Design a protein around this ligand. Structure first.
Ligand code: HEM
Length: 388
């Protein structure tokens, strides 16, 4: 019985999802009221469900049963409404546009590393993996420096998974919205060089984002740019520190960075599972009776370790090529921010290993502290030794 809120999943979700992949790769469970769900752990079956038009991302198809901007973003839409919303933001994440951010991201990395070099130890989360994506997002969205401390408080509170804090989370949502509504108003009138201005002025086939569509879009982008990108950097650093022979390869040959980032995505699966998927009708898959309204959980972490698709899947190989991981999902909803996550990872891992060639883990395996989150696999802290 899969228990995503249980101790074993918190200790190592990869080993739980892997056991399901080998023993019961299509598994019915109850997600805690309670709601029926299916856990899909093999790569081939994950692919089939990612392409299957019997699966919706919009829970209305199945109900049966403001801050409404939070659940109206494009990742909660199917075609054709998804297609329009994606075409209105797409241009913000094309290869040149994102590549053009390189110099600014390098500068943030080097500034954070200058602070870390004042000492011979650090918590990589506090010092480097958490602040870097936050500053990148802040710069990209044009959040003035005087507003960043506050923006950090809101963005942290508004994604809290603690069920009991729901009124307080809703409040932070409302405050985030009011803040961005002021920026949107101001930039519609006087546009600047930032992504809120660019979204406000985007038009495609005669259509623009409405005020509410802007709230939803900026909400989604900010949430993505923060905790999950942080987790790439944190968990990727951890994986490099646990695999010294692969760390040394990359340190000696930084041209390996592009394959290395893809391997770290595969092995660390920052989004370890994803759901928010429902069957629109009853159907059978491999003898299993899927029902209208059943939720589908896509086991990224285990799919990324499936030996039908990856050789020696449990081994970190920073030169793995090709590497057809699904860490960014697949198909319609494939991550929009993938080039930015990849650029941040490229810059950050190279920069850290250049500045601190002697970096080493300063926490025993049993003491490593992971955040409580079913879907997002992320460290609470990451103590390291930097130098003597
Ligand atoms: C390592 C970092 C990241 C990982 C692993 C990641 C992973 C994912 C995954 C798995 C999906 C598909 C979710 C589903 O289908 O349920 C997704 C979608 C998306 N991601 Fe990311 N993401 C990352 C960073 C970012 C960043 C930096 C941004 C933007 C700032 C972003 C923006 C989006 C958006 C807008 C979508 C929805 C796309 C659509 O519905 O068409 N992501 N991402």
């Amino acid at each position: 019985m899969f228990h995503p809120h249980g101790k074993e999943f918190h200790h190592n979700p990869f080993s739980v999802l892997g056991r399901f992949r080998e023993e019961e790769p299509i598994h019915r469970f109850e997600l805690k009221a309670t709601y029926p769900a299916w856990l899909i752990t093999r790569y081939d079956d994950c692919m089939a469900f990612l392409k299957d038009n019997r699966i919706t991302r919009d829970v209305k198809n199945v109900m049966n049963q403001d801050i409404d901007f939070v659940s109206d973003h494009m990742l909660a839409k199917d075609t054709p409404d998804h297609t329009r919303l994606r075409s209105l933001v797409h241009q913000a994440f094309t290869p040149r546009t994102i590549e053009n951010l390189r110099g600014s991201i390098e500068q943030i990395a080097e500034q954070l590393l200058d602070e870390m070099e004042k000492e011979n130890k650090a918590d990589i989360m506090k010092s480097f993996a958490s602040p870097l994506p936050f500053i990148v997002i802040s710069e990209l969205m044009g959040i003035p420096k005087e507003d960043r401390s506050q923006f950090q408080i809101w963005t942290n509170a508004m994604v809290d998974t603690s069920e009991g804090n729901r009124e307080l989370t809703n409040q932070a949502l409302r405050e985030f919205k009011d803040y961005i509504a002021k920026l949107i108003h101001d930039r519609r009138i006087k546009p600047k060089d930032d992504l809120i201005s660019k979204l406000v002025h985007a038009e495609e086939n005669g259509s623009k984002l409405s005020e509410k569509e802007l709230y939803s879009m900026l909400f989604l982008l900010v949430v993505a740019g923060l905790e999950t990108t942080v987790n790439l950097l944190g968990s990727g650093t951890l994986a490099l520190l646990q695999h010294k022979k692969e760390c040394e390869k990359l340190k000696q040959q930084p041209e390996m960075i592009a394959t290395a980032v893809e391997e770290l995505l595969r092995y660390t699966s920052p989004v370890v599972m994803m759901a928010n998927r429902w069957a629109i009708e009853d159907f059978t898959y491999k003898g299993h009776s899927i029902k209208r309204g059943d939720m589908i959980f896509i086991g990224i972490g285990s799919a990324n370790r499936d030996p039908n698709f990856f050789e020696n899947p449990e081994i970190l190989n920073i030169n793995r090529s090709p590497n057809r991981h699904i860490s960014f999902g697949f198909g319609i909803h494939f991550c929009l921010g993938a080039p930015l996550a990849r650029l941040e990872g490229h810059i950050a891992f190279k920069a850290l290993l250049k500045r601190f060639p002697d970096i080493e883990l300063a926490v025993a395996p049993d003491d490593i502290q992971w955040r409580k989150n079913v879907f997002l696999r992320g460290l609470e802290s990451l103590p390291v030794s930097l130098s003597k």
